[PDB]
Amino acid sequence: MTAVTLDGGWRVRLVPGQEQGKTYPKAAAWLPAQVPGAVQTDLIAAKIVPDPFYRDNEGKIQWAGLSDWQYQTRFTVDAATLKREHVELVFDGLDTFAEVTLNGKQLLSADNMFRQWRVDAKSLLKRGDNLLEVKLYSPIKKIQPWLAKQPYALPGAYDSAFGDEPEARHSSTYVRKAPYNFGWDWGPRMVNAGIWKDVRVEAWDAVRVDGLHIAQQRVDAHSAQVQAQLDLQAGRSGPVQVTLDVLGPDGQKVGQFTQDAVVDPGQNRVDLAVRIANPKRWFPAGYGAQDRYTFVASVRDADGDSQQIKRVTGLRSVELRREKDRFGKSMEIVINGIPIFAKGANLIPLDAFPARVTHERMRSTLQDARDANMNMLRMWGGGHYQDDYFYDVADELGIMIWQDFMFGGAVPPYDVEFRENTRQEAIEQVKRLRDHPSLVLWCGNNAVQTGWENWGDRVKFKQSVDPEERTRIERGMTTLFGTVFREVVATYDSDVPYWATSPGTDFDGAADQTNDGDMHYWKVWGGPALPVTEYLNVTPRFMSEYGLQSFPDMRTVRAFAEPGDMDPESPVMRVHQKFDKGNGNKRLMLYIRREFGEPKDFESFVYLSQLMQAEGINIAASHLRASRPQSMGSLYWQLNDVWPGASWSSVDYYGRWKALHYHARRFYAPEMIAALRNDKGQTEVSLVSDRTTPLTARWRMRVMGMDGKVLSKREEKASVNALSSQHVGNFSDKQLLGSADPKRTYAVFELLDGDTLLSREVVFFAPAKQLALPAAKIDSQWRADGDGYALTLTSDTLAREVWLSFGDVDATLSDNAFDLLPGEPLTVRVTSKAALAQLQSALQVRDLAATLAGAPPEP
Amino acid sequence: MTAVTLDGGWRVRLVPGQEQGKTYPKAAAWLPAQVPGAVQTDLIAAKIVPDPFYRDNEGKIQWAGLSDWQYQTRFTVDAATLKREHVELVFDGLDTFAEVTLNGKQLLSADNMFRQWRVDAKSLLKRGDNLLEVKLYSPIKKIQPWLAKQPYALPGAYDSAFGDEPEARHSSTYVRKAPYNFGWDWGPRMVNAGIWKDVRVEAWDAVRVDGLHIAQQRVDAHSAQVQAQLDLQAGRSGPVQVTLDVLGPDGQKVGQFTQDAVVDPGQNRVDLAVRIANPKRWFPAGYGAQDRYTFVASVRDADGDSQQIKRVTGLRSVELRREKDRFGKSMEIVINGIPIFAKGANLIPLDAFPARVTHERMRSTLQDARDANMNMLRMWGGGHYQDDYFYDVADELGIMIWQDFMFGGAVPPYDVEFRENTRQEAIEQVKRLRDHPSLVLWCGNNAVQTGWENWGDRVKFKQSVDPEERTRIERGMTTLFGTVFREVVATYDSDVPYWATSPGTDFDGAADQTNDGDMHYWKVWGGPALPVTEYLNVTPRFMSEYGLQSFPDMRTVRAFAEPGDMDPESPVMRVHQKFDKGNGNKRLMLYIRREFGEPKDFESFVYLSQLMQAEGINIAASHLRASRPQSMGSLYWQLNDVWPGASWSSVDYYGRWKALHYHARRFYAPEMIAALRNDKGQTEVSLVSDRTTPLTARWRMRVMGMDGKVLSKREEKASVNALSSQHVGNFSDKQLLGSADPKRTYAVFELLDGDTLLSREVVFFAPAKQLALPAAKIDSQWRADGDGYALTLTSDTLAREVWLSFGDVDATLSDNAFDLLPGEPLTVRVTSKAALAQLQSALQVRDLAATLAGAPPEP
């Protein structure tokens, strides 16, 4: 069994006879091509187009997504590999409409970005030099001429901001290709074409090992019963001997198991039953260890040749518990018998060009989530199924994955061919990802049903066609998302639950309800753009989407913009604001002004955008956690970015944390105090614990004047049950303030375990722009702290949302966007590779009071 | 492991306090009850109501379906069975809404006729004597008050002919109960209430064997790979040893297999892989042997107790092949790589009271099918899942079963509770029936989609409700019939195909199409009531329903009717005509008069009704077979009867063959000649062969005058491919007759293999009533042939549709309803228990010419 990768001498050019051939003669000629990669990124490297992320260069590359491309590479095949009984070419990823030829002969037709294509090539292969050609066809150019003739176009995704597709007639719906490639409201339009995954020549004789699956039949504390399933493709009938070694988390051997069999031409499965007594189970982050066992299977074929395959797996039971109670019907993920309140966010692709994403970026994205006390990411259906390495790290860090199939919201066609194409995709992805313990849920799509029921364009569309046509289309969706995907999961990964659509009730009834299933709440930010306190009025059984937009870090801003661009209304900044067809800055400023009024300069604009977002999500996330067991999930939109620009992320494209992420670590803390004041002057205080043991705690309440005087101080003992929320307070403004000036008063709430401070929240009684915040003087002291530095900040007065930065000097901080209490020192750890001397000169310290001072009036 | 059956001292009465208790005081008091049984049949045995099958007695028993009933029995449990760690009561069948109490305490609530109800009873079981009580509630009485409050009633089945349910508001839809119990257009309204299957006390200690499934993973000529799957319920953790012995069709040893494991509390699976080299596969009738292997698993638990379970199964591959071709998309059952043209009929329950059906009747029903050269029966969804024994015989005789789940056409409710109740029903039936090799296909329902799309009442209903409510209802159906049933089959019986609805395209598109999926064609008989020659103009890929009605055997008529009742329009005969709300005799007479004019007496009416049906179905089935590969299925409606009366059956309630069944043996013959004359005077001649080898054949065509003179004779050679139909002729009336009188001329077509005549068809050129048929004289000669008799008939002239009978003396005939050619003797075998003398006295020989002679004019 050999497997050589064709990752070398590829080149690419425009298919001859296109008008782009005249416009870009250098693209008509052969240019270097990278595999895996995209022609887009090949063009960039070749200086044919500039970096589309920089300033307003996005439009300069759109022509590549409208053109057809021709890949070519030459490779040699040994006399030894040609000897072999089977020689196959394997394509892990072709994006998307591909026509492959070998030595001029037809080899393969492909039409799914997410499928693996295996093809017998032995008869077409020559001794030595071979010519492999791949032609990739623009999905827009291929589909639109057909689409223009259809009685209707299906409701889709986003219109082209470049007008190269008609309004409300999107081709993206009809092709199995990453939805975000066509542009989304936080990313550019990069309709990629490319051999975006590996290409291999594989050769074997008697048997080819197609897979190993550790099927968990039942897992609890007492035992785990599993079945090692081995898929074997055979060319001829003959004996095989299978040996299975099992290693525990500590690396010691658990047991060896053997199985003899006779395989026959075609597919064969060999199953080895394994029972592990008192298993060291895999838990998500915050609920134990991420223990994993190693299963090593070696297969001796009829020729006496041995092949080996390995799976690292975590033993875990997964239950999607939906039981009736006072709040309707629950929706809670239960891991190893433990109801886990989901704390996390929505995960999108890490780049507009997915093939160039490094392992380091994959890991730091998940590491970011783990650091903010998250236990789950939802891999949103508008993106692409992630790299193997990504799921490995998720397993390792204990970040649960809510895995959407890659449907982003468009209404799918109901033709059999589309369905069967998608089925094969679903089968291969589920087979690929199932042994990852972190993958705990499969979901049919993002927002398809709730769009059909609530979005104006969908509602109008379904009522415009004949009722019989509506039935056909609705039947197609119910079959694809309710039958097909569900069957694939039930067949190949049967120990994990399936979910038809997010948000929804698994087709039991309507989508996006508050008393059944999950919810995407967007009446804050979107729609009527309600104030953020409205979050306190919305409590679904599980909140899988909600969010606020903000700008990325100033370093990231300076990365895509010039000094003359530094204005939210500049052409460059408007390009990087993708919400509401480029008019998103109006919505962003709406929310900023409500709390902070008019920003006095651009750096303040960025800072205040991030504060607006952070404080807003803090309200909703704390409330959801405090509402347990009414709610059992919080996944905000969104975690990360594909590109430098404005978005709902908490971490920008370059991995830099926004104020939101620092806040997320706090409101997602395992033990947390929630002190939330509603628009009726009532502040509800709750003690939240994700411990599986009782928390014998103390909680404090101190009401302060901003001139430093204490108005009141109070401390109580509290016994907080495991896995629960306990309301310990509900105070009116009068009960807290008592005739004191709300513009000059604030409250400090703290949760304690013994002498250890676990959580703190500072509450205010008026929008920040109306407050009389003190002019803080913040002393900073440095000292050598290992290979990093210890930075201690001490403010004489209250200092709000202190933000530390270092110009263009790169450094990471253990904490940021924090409140400083009068005379109370805070020490943060500074990790950098710069010397202490420049860090001290470059240090910038910003606070809210200072930022709001000297601000102009709102328009 | 003990399992005692409560099949003894049951009694039953009306639940006290009903108005029926006053009307029927004898039913208010305790009366003997039979278990299994129905309270209806208990009332008959007790002489409280007369036999509802007799004359017009049907209405006198309707009150039992509107009442609530109370079963009661006493039984003793020794101290030895109380020893056991688990003691359970098991109800295999409760019809339907049941409330069970034990020694005065609530034990079980049941609401599905088709589920098995297991309950722990150990804590409630007493020393010695125990009191078991079961209350059954009328589904009509229970549901209607709820239904009357509903905004709408779902489209259902048949209205009550007794007005005890409102029109178009049927309770039958909302309850899991055999649809035909509520009355159908060929059966009485018997809303049965009863403990209609066994009740057991079961007891066990460490391990209980919940099931054994021989899962066929891949089967071909070279090998069969299977996995013996054993379900074990354990009360505590401990070791087990499993032994599997495999015996071949000859009873000899194939191999023994062993497997040790440790079971844990709850459910445990133990799988033993078995590969059988050169398996002797199971073939359907006419395509080989019905070879079956025996799998015997014995399980020794930790206590050392050995339990044994056994499965007899046939190794078989099943494929539902749907490939694109010239006629659209095919639909064919492929068994062991052989495309089988399905030849058979639709199977309904054998009785209005299913619990009293004997094994002999189950067996003779399937034997009937086998004898008429059938290879498939469809167990129609309006009935009930059959007895285990029934499927056993089907396995034995090689009659394939198309198994509908028991939904008859009503539009189901979309509530979660109904769905989950039904899901459990499906799981239990699929688990019970899967190891029967004869079960080759599962089907969601009968006619639900085509009704929804084509029946006027459904169309009006779905357009009357709110479109969002319409979407809800359609979503409910698509989930139940497209997801739930499909998942159950894919999970528990995964080597056989599933079909969403008959007729349909498995939800790919519209139902009942001609170029995709299967069809129920009823424009002949039903709807516009087209002439039978219209059958030649309809050619679907698979015809799963079609038919013509007729009366049962004269002996059967005399069984339910008095001499004063012998008139199609009498009150008694109308009661036994259930088509079109009792006005069915008009539709029957329409078709009869078309071909034969007005019947001269009642016996002629019966005979001609059977000829009309027989000749009509002969046209369609022959046409369908001759059209191969355009069509690949012929299942006519219907095979059998639930009750004595008029229906589309070929075999009446007492097992007596109609003319149709005798004709069916001919047109389903493995080699058949089809000579079909259409409404344009064109006779197409086809040679059909179901052989797996080529047929080198000879076929003849002779044109005859009614006076015996030969007009023309022709013989031609033909090489008929394996598994095909070949057109060898297409003659106009002019080419055949040539100025000869069509009323005085006929044609004889014959298919031969060497000197062996394989099939014959006699063609006419005018309806029988216009013909000048000769006055035949038919000589009859007897002779002893073992314990039966050989009866030889010789006609001097042409004798059409000769029908042999013996008054009320019972006898069976090897052939009947045949044509006699001049001077050509035919010998049939007579099986009876009467002496020759009485057979000779009772013998009646009827032919078409004699019957048509002296007939009065049509009204």
Ligand SMILES: OC[C@H]1O[C@@H](O)[C@@H](O)[C@@H](O)[C@@H]1O
């Ligand atoms: O032109 C491309 C289009 O071709 C038609 O046949 C559609 O059925 C799709 O397969 C596709 O969107």
Ligand SMILES: OC[C@H]1O[C@@H](O)[C@@H](O)[C@@H](O)[C@@H]1O
């Ligand atoms: O529409 C509300 C949000 O929904 C999410 O699923 C994504 O599509 C976002 O880009 C969008 O802003």
Ligand SMILES: OC[C@H]1O[C@@H](O)[C@@H](O)[C@@H](O)[C@@H]1O
């Ligand atoms: O009570 C009769 C019927 O009443 C309603 O609850 C229905 O939904 C059914 O579940 C039930 O059988």
Ligand SMILES: OC[C@H]1O[C@@H](O)[C@@H](O)[C@@H](O)[C@@H]1O
């Ligand atoms: O369609 C209304 C009713 O009457 C006839 O059409 C039959 O098909 C019934 O099964 C149906 O329920």
Ligand SMILES: OC[C@H]1O[C@@H](O)[C@@H](O)[C@@H](O)[C@@H]1O
């Ligand atoms: O609807 C026409 C026919 O359909 C079949 O499914 C059965 O229900 C028959 O009783 C009926 O006559």
